[PDB]
Amino acid sequence: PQDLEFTRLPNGLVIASLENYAPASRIGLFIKAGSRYENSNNLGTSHLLRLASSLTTKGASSFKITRGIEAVGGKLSVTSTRENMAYTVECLRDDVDILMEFLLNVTTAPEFRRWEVAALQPQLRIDKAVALQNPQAHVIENLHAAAYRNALANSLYCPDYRIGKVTPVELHDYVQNHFTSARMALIGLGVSHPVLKQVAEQFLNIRGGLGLSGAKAKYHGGEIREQNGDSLVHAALVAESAAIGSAEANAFSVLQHVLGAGPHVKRGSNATSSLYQAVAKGVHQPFDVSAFNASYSDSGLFGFYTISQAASAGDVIKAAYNQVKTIAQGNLSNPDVQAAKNKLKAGYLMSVESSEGFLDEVGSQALAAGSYTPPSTVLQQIDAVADADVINAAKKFVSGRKSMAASGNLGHTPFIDEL
Amino acid sequence: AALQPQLRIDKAVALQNPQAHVIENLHAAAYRNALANSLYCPDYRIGKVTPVELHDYVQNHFTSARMALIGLGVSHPVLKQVAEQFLNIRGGLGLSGAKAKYHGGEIREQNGDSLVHAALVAESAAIGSAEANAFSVLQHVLGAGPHVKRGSNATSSLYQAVAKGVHQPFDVSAFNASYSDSGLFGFYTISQAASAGDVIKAAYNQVKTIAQGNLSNPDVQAAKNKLKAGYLMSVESSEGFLDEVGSQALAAGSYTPPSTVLQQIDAVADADVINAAKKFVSGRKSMAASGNLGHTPFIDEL
Amino acid sequence: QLARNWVPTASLWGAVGAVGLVWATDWRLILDW
Amino acid sequence: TATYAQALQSVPETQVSQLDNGLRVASEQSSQPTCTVGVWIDAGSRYESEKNNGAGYFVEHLAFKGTKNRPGNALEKEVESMGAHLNAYSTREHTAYYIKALSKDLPKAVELLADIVQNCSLEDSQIEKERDVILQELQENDTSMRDVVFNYLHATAFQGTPLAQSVEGPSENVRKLSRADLTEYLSRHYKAPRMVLAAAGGLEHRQLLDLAQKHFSGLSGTYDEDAVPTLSPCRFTGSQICHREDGLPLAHVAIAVEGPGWAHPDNVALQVANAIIGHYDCTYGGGAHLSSPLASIAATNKLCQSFQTFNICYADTGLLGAHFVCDHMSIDDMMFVLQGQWMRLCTSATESEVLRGKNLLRNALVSHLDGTTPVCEDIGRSLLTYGRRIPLAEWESRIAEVDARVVREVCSKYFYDQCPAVAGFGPIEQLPDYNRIRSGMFWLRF
Amino acid sequence: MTNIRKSHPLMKIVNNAFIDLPAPSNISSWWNFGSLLGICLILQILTGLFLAMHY
Amino acid sequence: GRPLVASVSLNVPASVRY
Amino acid sequence: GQAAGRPLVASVSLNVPASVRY
Amino acid sequence: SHTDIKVPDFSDYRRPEVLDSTKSSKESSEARKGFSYLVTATTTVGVAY
Numbered sequence A: 001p002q003d004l005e006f007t008r009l010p011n012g013l014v015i016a017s018l019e020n021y022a023p024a025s026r027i028g029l030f031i032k033a034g035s036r037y038e039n040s041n042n043l044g045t046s047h048l049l050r051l052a053s054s055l056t057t058k059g060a061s062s063f064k065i066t067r068g069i070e071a072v073g074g075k076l077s078v079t080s081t082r083e084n085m086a087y088t089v090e091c092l093r094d095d096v097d098i099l100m101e102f103l104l105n106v107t108t109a110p111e112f113r114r115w116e117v118a119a120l121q122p123q124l125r126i127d128k129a130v131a132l133q134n135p136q137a138h139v140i141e142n143l144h145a146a147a148y149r150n151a152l153a154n155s156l157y158c159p160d161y162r163i164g165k166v167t168p169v170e171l172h173d174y175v176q177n178h179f180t181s182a183r184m185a186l187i188g189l190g191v192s193h194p195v196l197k198q199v200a201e202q203f204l205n206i207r208g209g210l211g212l213s214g215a216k217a218k219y220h221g222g223e224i225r226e227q228n229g230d231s232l233v234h235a236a237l238v239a240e241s242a243a244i245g246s247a248e249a250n251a252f253s254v255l256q257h258v259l260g261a262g263p264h265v266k267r268g269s270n271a272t273s274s275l276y277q278a279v280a281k282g283v284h285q286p287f288d289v290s291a292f293n294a295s296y297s298d299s300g301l302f303g304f305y306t307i308s309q310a311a312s313a314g315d316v317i318k319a320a321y322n323q324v325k326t327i328a329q330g331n332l333s334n335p336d337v338q339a340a341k342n343k344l345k346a347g348y349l350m351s352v353e354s355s356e357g358f359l360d361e362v363g364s365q366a367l368a369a370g371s372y373t374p375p376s377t378v379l380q381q382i383d384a385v386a387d388a389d390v391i392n393a394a395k396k397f398v399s400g401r402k403s404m405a406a407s408g409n410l411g412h413t414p415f416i417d418e419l
Numbered sequence B: 001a002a003l004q005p006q007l008r009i010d011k012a013v014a015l016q017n018p019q020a021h022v023i024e025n026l027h028a029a030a031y032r033n034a035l036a037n038s039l040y041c042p043d044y045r046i047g048k049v050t051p052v053e054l055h056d057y058v059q060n061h062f063t064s065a066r067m068a069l070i071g072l073g074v075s076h077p078v079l080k081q082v083a084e085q086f087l088n089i090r091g092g093l094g095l096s097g098a099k100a101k102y103h104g105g106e107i108r109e110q111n112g113d114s115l116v117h118a119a120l121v122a123e124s125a126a127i128g129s130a131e132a133n134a135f136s137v138l139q140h141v142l143g144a145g146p147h148v149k150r151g152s153n154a155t156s157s158l159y160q161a162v163a164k165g166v167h168q169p170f171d172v173s174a175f176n177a178s179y180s181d182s183g184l185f186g187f188y189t190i191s192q193a194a195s196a197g198d199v200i201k202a203a204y205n206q207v208k209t210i211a212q213g214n215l216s217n218p219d220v221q222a223a224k225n226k227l228k229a230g231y232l233m234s235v236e237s238s239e240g241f242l243d244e245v246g247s248q249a250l251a252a253g254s255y256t257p258p259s260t261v262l263q264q265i266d267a268v269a270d271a272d273v274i275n276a277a278k279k280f281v282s283g284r285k286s287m288a289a290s291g292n293l294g295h296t297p298f299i300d301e302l
Numbered sequence C: 001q002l003a004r005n006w007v008p009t010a011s012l013w014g015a016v017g018a019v020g021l022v023w024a025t026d027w028r029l030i031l032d033w
Numbered sequence D: 001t002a003t004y005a006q007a008l009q010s011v012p013e014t015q016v017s018q019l020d021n022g023l024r025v026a027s028e029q030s031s032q033p034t035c036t037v038g039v040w041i042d043a044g045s046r047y048e049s050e051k052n053n054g055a056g057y058f059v060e061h062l063a064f065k066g067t068k069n070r071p072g073n074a075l076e077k078e079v080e081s082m083g084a085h086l087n088a089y090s091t092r093e094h095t096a097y098y099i100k101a102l103s104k105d106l107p108k109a110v111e112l113l114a115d116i117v118q119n120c121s122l123e124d125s126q127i128e129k130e131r132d133v134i135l136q137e138l139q140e141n142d143t144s145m146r147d148v149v150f151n152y153l154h155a156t157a158f159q160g161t162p163l164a165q166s167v168e169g170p171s172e173n174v175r176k177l178s179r180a181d182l183t184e185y186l187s188r189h190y191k192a193p194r195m196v197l198a199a200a201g202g203l204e205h206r207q208l209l210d211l212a213q214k215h216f217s218g219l220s221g222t223y224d225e226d227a228v229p230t231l232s233p234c235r236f237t238g239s240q241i242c243h244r245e246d247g248l249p250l251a252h253v254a255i256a257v258e259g260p261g262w263a264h265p266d267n268v269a270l271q272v273a274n275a276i277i278g279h280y281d282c283t284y285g286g287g288a289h290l291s292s293p294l295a296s297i298a299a300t301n302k303l304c305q306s307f308q309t310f311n312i313c314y315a316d317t318g319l320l321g322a323h324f325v326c327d328h329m330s331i332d333d334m335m336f337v338l339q340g341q342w343m344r345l346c347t348s349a350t351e352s353e354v355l356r357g358k359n360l361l362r363n364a365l366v367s368h369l370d371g372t373t374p375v376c377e378d379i380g381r382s383l384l385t386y387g388r389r390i391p392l393a394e395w396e397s398r399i400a401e402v403d404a405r406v407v408r409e410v411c412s413k414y415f416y417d418q419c420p421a422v423a424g425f426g427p428i429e430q431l432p433d434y435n436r437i438r439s440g441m442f443w444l445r446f
Numbered sequence E: 001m002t003n004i005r006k007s008h009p010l011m012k013i014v015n016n017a018f019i020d021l022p023a024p025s026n027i028s029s030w031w032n033f034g035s036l037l038g039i040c041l042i043l044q045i046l047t048g049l050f051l052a053m054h055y
Numbered sequence F: 001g002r003p004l005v006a007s008v009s010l011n012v013p014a015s016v017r018y
Numbered sequence G: 001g002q003a004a005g006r007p008l009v010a011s012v013s014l015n016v017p018a019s020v021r022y
Numbered sequence H: 001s002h003t004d005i006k007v008p009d010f011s012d013y014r015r016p017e018v019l020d021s022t023k024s025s026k027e028s029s030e031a032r033k034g035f036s037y038l039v040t041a042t043t044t045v046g047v048a049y
């Protein structure tokens, strides 16, 4: 039906909505406070905080909400990241109100009680376990140390001695401090904007306080090497890319799909990707290659990450690394830019086409801007990127202090000094 | 295989003292290949050790050429009798391909401790020259093993040069150790969280002063006085002497009388240690970080 | 709770009890054949 | 507006269109720049002979290795030059070919898709590559105990029919296959009715049917005989399988009994049957307060690291049971405490407890519909299963059917005093012996 | 042993010296005897007992 | 590569992503 | 950094528990 | 690998009613069971006497 309607309120909290004709009725809350606000003594907070949703509110007893949710057959959701912590909630068209109420008391009416609090420690390791299977997971965090110093490098996962370290009082401060009506952004989907707007300012207006932004994160070069006995090494190399919200990050976001490929054909040796081909040509049999780009508010990180064998490691590196130079030499195929756009646009769409993916992308704007760019203009923006743009952008990559992280047998592994 | 469990129990106790824990990580920052290798089995490396591996490494690095035997109070012949007898095998020997390639870098590891540990070292010379001795002079110049218990050590400038511009408990020592193909000279500090960076330059820039040509020649003597005596008081013990005997053996194969050694000690010129000291600040330096890093600067602040 | 089933099964057992319950004791009764 | 009552009314419906040689056309409009085109094939592993086993699998790989008209890896570049994602998959019954794409490049898609559907470049260049690649995989596939344990279960009951056999078949035919059999099995089973075609996106129907038309009006894709439609009732065997190995930490164990075919009313009730038990695993935020009896209790003592349930209904067959993971010394617990959660249903069960599950399955199917592709996939199986049927609102009606008696009628059939089969993998060791389970299925009323 | 009627009275935990007593596969009838023995002992106990009454 | 990643806990289900 | 009588640290075990050093 | 296994055949011990695999096991199943139980019930009775 009608498209995005977002109403700026006095509380600074933007309430956006549509209405659908669909039975799906969903809601989610997005807040700016992620890992990056955990200070040296605030560490792991979010990591554990995110795990609290099952506790007893001041509104409701924990047991209640439990038998509360399943009785509806509805569903609750929790999500965190380096930047935007978020809760997500969904149920059938009709009954959201009761659950809507529940969404309130959660962030509205916190309770911290030692027996309640402390007993949930053991969950952490069981948690912290499974993700660490994939070293690619394990690889990500250590990386952020190499590129920064203070905040962004902070893990999404509680440091180990930091585990017996978490008291209730700490939370409640961090609760209110980073929770304000200004920083809270709410999105509706298929429901009347008024019922949205009704409750909106009502419960959700509190303060004030603290967005405290003092982390510039100071992108800083360095590398880190950690030794395992694995037969398949993991290593990455990244240079600072631009901040989000410019064609520059898009230039890399172009430049990623230029070089980098999420697989478009299963089992296929990917020919249209030069690098992978440019690798296997001069290299030998199993390996895997991908270029990496991700950005945030105050910066972005663009590079490549490789997985090969022990001797394979250094070989892949320059073969991949010097391959990058070629485009940094002015080598380009403009039709590729189109195909990249073709890829870039479509892949973007195919991500946004899903409801929930779209759901995110909606409110992703919110804590960022507070407006909505139609995807059309976005697509127009995509075309807007010049060729030499990405080229010079690419030039920066090799043209600046680069960072490395090392996971695997290091036996043959070069340092940065070889690069 | 049954002796695996001993390892952790072993590997445990030493790791109490972070100063222990500090040493090894350090060697990573200054090198790449060999010297940085720990004296302690890496963790996944534990279930990793088969017999066959050993026996190769047994014979490979074991040769009559590389084996050096010392007697003490016993007839040289009974020594010499059995000597060539059993101990003559091969050969094979000695596989020296590690130059260790001193290489700059730093490493930072985060704990929750209230007392930080950090060190800064520049490459010093190889053992077996007055140059390493110049640092070995320069250590006892700046650095002090305590000669008075409980004493705030005045004759050490740095420690005083620290506490003068700094505050409440801390501890300061300069570090030097060498080997065949190189040596490592620097200082290592333990202070509080805010105390950390403060101590650093206050200590670090203090070093510059001597690198500025500032020197007191009588101190050199006292240093020698210290250096000679302390050396002696180490060598005076039998076993300490026992080591120092055969320490020569795998090194040289001769014996320098301590007299000439003492003469060698005097032989060091003043500007020698000065320029040697100059190198220290004058070259790529390495760092390792143990403690709360909250205030901890990087090398870039230094 | 208005337990629904097992109500019929209940009648059975006491009855399953009941019939044999005389089949032990054996006394004045009706049908022979 | 949107009301869950109204929302059942406003739908783009599935479309029906026929070709002459047996291919079916169908479609739905998403008012969307993108569309998911796919092709479904009912050729089952159970059609292939024992020697033919693993072929289609091997074959599926061969498709995008370049086709008769379009040799190797000029194919991908185009779809990549387009920017479209491309994927395919297999199943003992069914093999899939599909693409996510914009509605713009649609025209080539079919004529690209169509070519490879039957026309195939057949060259021994790949035959050894894939064989080695497959021999690589076959030996690598031993890594996940999960996919391991399944096949055992099929062979357990379904021994005697091709249904139980591996998708990928014996390692030996992997070496032993000539592409004659391929072409031969290419030959038999790829003519219609076997073929089924659909797609979904902003496309409606007509503008599909025009550019459906002539290939693949068509290339035939035929219908003659190739027997008909050959399948047979598969044997349902009460039995056990035990592979005892003491090295690994845990033992994947699951349990099952046979069930009805795809199409049947009972197919509905069973959906809510598993809605009752729920499922627990390590890292759920569940905690002790969960409503499901085992989800709370089997977590309480962590009698399981994890468990779930499964339901699959074949043509003439169906499967019921749960799949669970726990430490070995306690394994006995789950088994003891799993059963009653069936049995107590069979007598004492309750209306309200179903509501949530009644609600859940309602909650379940609704959420199934996000994104382009999922609808596309539905159509194919639906056609292969119930045909045209998308009884969308009718589902609820099918759900509204449900009653406490209705349930306590259902489980009466397939559970109380039946013959289960046993699938297990080391460290099985403490697994209660068979004859317990059997005399353990039916209560004595205790 | 969740809600197992073995542990509810502590007594029946002892009763698990039997149910779950592991046992060898190949066993002659010649291993019936051990259990067979106690049988006679019981049946006896009653007989001489009621006999003991009138004697 | 990865998003980079994400974290998911919530109530009844869960997983990790990239 | 503690050596000061000598070069760096130690490893010894024979009997007596174990010894680290400067 | 794992794949090469196939269950060996016991059928000698079976009875032919289910010997056809193209029978659904459910059909004989109906009458199939009771005869087994029939003994069970049957065997039980005389004991009580």
Ligand code: HEM
Residues within 6 Å of the ligand: E031, E032, E033, E034, E035, E036, E037, E038
């Ligand atoms: C009425 C007297 C006895 C009773 C009630 C009795 C009871 C049992 C029972 C129940 C068993 C376990 C089953 C079996 O292994 O047979 C057993 C085993 C055994 N009994 Fe006794 N037993 C009796 C007499 C004896 C005697 C007289 C001896 C030796 C002189 C004896 C030595 C053993 C031995 C060695 C076994 C284990 C035999 C094997 O491993 O097969 N028992 N007895």
Ligand code: HEM
Residues within 6 Å of the ligand: E040, E041, E044, E045, E046, E047, E048, E049, E050, E051, E052, E055
């Ligand atoms: C293995 C168990 C027992 C044996 C082998 C045994 C032995 C005997 C013997 C040798 C006789 C006399 C034989 C005969 O009268 O023909 C007998 C009878 C008797 N036994 Fe036992 N005794 C056993 C247990 C008992 C028990 C449990 C009781 C009493 C409860 C008992 C009490 C008697 C009495 C009262 C008689 C008198 C009946 C009679 O002598 O005719 N004995 N028993």
